[PDB]
Amino acid sequence: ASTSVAASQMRNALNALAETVPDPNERKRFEAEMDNFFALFRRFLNDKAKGNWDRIAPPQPSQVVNYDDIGKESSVEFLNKLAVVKLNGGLGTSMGCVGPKSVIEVREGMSFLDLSVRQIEHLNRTYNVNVPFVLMNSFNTDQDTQSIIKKYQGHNVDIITFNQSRYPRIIKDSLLPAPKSFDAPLQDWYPPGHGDVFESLYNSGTLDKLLERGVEYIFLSNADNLGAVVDTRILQHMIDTKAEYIMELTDKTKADVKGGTIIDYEGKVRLLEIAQVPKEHVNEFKSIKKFKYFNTNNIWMNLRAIKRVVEENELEMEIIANEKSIPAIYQLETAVGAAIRHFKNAHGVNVPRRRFLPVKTCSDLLLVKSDLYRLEHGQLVMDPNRFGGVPVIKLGSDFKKVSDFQKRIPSIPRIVELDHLTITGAVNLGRNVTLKGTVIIVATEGSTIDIPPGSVLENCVVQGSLRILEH
Amino acid sequence: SDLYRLEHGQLVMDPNRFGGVPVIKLGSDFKKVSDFQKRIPSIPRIVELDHLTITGAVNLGRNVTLKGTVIIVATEGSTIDIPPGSVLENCVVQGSLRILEH
Amino acid sequence: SDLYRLEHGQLVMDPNRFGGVPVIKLGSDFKKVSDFQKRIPSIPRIVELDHLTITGAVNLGRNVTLKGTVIIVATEGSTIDIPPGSVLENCVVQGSLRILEH
Amino acid sequence: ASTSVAASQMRNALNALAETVPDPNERKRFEAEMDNFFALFRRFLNDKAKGNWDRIAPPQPSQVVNYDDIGKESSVEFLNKLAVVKLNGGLGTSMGCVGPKSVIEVREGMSFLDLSVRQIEHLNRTYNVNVPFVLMNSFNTDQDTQSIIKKYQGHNVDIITFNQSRYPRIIKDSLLPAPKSFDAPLQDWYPPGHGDVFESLYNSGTLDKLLERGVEYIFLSNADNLGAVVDTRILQHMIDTKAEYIMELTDKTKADVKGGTIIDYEGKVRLLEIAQVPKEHVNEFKSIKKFKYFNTNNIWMNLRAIKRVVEENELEMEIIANEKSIPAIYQLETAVGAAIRHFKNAHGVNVPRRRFLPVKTCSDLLLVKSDLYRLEHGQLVMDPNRFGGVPVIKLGSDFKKVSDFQKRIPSIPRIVELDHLTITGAVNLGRNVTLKGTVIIVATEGSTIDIPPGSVLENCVVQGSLRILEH
């Protein structure tokens, strides 16, 4: 009974916000937006009252296509109908940086956004075609974004921006929205999951704006994955298979045992994570067998398919519950891959790892700024002279914040011919440091190790304390 | 060191060296000529060096370059293994650092 | 270790082991085969181990299990007595720990 | 087949040594002595070639008599037939002391042997009876023993001494006796287990010497257990039950989980230890249930029964194999309790723990020298004011040798009202130190803690380093 009472109170609270609003257009948007959460909230309570490893069958050979099997490059003429959409909801707060994550620099002063545009520019200049580049922004970044985007004026680049849905936070105890007024503080709201993209594209009118230029194929990728470069080869497979949803996949490395994996689920290709795998089978799920692929989040989609699922309202997503404590609330989120099940001819492709190089933590930023990578017209390609895979770098807990990183490593060490590197404690690397083979540095608790400039280290362990002060 | 060249058996200082000979004063640990080969397997480059002091256990790897003034003061009883290729310019070095093969 | 089994005198690695053989590199203290029996009275379980480094005085108790990468760096001159039954997963270990019978 | 070959070679080697002998009396002794080992060696190989927890049934209520149930003290008249025999095979080498263990001092300069005689002396003077006191010596101690025993001359004390069997060491590889000649070095011989007492008493003529004074009851106890005082109460139970073998037992404490325990074995009361309990059940055997008693080694026996088992050759013992490395060899030994099976009406008595206080290690010598015990005419009785059991004292590895003990603890600390004490590392205790409750001392590795004189410690942890040097 309490569920119906809560639903009634929730409905009245959701409607009360919709009643206190200054403009009709906002009311229309807010009503449709807020009415979706009422249904979600109902399912959430119902799904908890209702609460299968047997159904977790391995992906059949028919469900995965190999990149080496795809045919010749797609003709330039077909690129006019392609479209690229980027998630732009990440703040630099994740890495202790001010502003949006997209604005933080990576190499030679360029921002992560800069490379994307630069990649778009490379396509237009090589064939004189204008691929639309849409940014799914967030309320936390739009204000900073609206400022910085002006730097891209002039240059032949069609930039369009929109803000995703702004749902309010729901009080954990009362199960009611924390904000009362329409102009309530941002702390009362949170951005929902990636799946909001489909409706957001429509609700903002971007779908019309996109349809206005006749784009038929949509490509999504996270701004954090610099490897998501436009490759005309993949578009041909799409044009041939006319699939409604194609996800790029990669073979799980030792570090990719965790994270989502595609499941056949009786042909109806699905996905699952630790968020829903039963604890009694997580160890089984972590086995290298049966689950050999993971979700890269690089996805190719049909714009009219997106329209149809929205027009049909068939879009139903796996709710993800997150909690926070406002100085307690619940948040509902969704994944970009979960939509795979509701699409015809939906199947995946396995691509070489050169397409997945995320920048989530300090250990990544060092690899990209080193001499191991070179930028050509905005594309990062590893030196063909490098044998084996990428070297493993794992810095200690002292290098968490991106600001401090510049203090301890004023110049990036030469990492060619390096095999494995571990750094723990206070370590300062001078200029022109060369590392070869395996290098293990373990600073004494509370002491500092100042690696002398010009140092050449080969297969050795370093431990102790060394101070270098100017005479 | 590389500061001297042998011609038909005569030592002549490099005409490129400005000023007098640099002052080198090693600590009490390097007294015996036999041990000298253990701690300094390869002589460091001493061109452009001004003054050098070494006290305590100091091991110099190959291709070490010293410029200006270099003062090395090892902790009593501990050892300082200067990593190979090190380039030192006008600075004081103190502490302990072990380099063991992996 | 438990990674190999002998059948009529032939060694074949367990087909369950993925990838190549794990890399093991013990420190300079374990040179002599006699001492080896003192510090490692029972071989640690090495299935699912990826990389292991041991430097300095390290004593491994019985039923020690190592998973992923394990780096043990003993303090110069001190000893680390890994307690029996220890299960280590992807971590660095440094310090000194003595286990004496009550 | 190899067993017969080894037995044949052993026989020839044993007989060859017995043939090369200077005197007939030795030949008589050596022939009987050496012939016993041939039979033992045969059984050893046979038992090894042949190689039951199901049969390990708990002791039935009929197998154990309680000390509180035994009747009134036995009348003085019945004491003329009692006899006490002591094992005197322990060397001070076990505790890093020179000479026999029996000679090392315990309190006020008295040796462990001194107290035994002193206990006998008190008994003879209170009733004018002369109980014979026989010492089962060893070749390792007789030479020092023959010297020191002279100090007991004059005083009304009948002292008789004899040496137990001297068996040769058997080479591990050849399975042959290591010594060749008759005058071979002592390193080629070893004293066998306690069970050798029965034959040794006979073969030495001591049985005649005892029978010559009409003694009918024999009592055995180890010289190391100062609690083995002659108590006329137990002799009455013997006179009443006329049992052929009575062993004193005590309830296993937390420290007595290990060590031998009586087993009913279908009425045929036996004993077993880790030496024969199956490894798959040792953990089960260590449980507090089923095995609640352990062997104290205090045993009461009938002298004519001992004679009969020797005359009848019914004496069969559980062989114990021990190994040594002469600067490898095998040694065969037996336990004083195992003989229980070959005796009629053999049953045990459970006595209060005041009868078991061994002196095996440093932790024992501290308890006995403290103010917690007082000596009256040579008998130790704990102060009736002490509540609870004896306090637990466990000194660290630095106090192993008895010589060093005098350096770090020049005066014993007051231990009344002490509950638990732990000492690790270099700790020096000054004079007049008082400990109350629980005291934990943990010295820093390599440093020393000099507890200042007069210190009073109550329920506390002590850690650090403190030096006291004369001004």
Numbering used by the authors:
A (entry chain C), D (entry chain H): 32 to 82, 86 to 361, 371 to 514
B (entry chain F), C (entry chain G): 413 to 514
From the primary publication:
In this study, we demonstrate that in A. nidulans, galF (FungiDB ID AN9148) is an essential gene encoding a UTP-specific UGP, referred to as AnUGP, a central enzyme in the metabolism of carbohydrates and assembly of the cell wall.
Endogenous native AnUGP was purified owing to its ability to bind a Ni-NTA affinity column without any added tag. Octameric AnUGP can be described as a tetramer of homodimers held together by two interfaces on the CT LβH, which is built of short β-strands (β17–β23) oriented parallel to each other and describing a triangular prism. The cryoEM map of the LβH region shows high local resolution (up to 3.2 Å), allowing the oligomerization interface to be described. The UDP-Glc binding site faces toward the inner cavity of the complex with four pockets each in both the upper and lower rings. AnUGP displays a strong preference for UTP and, accordingly, in the structure, it is evident that the presence of small residues, Gly123 and Gly124, in the NB loop is vital for reducing steric clashes with the uridine moiety.
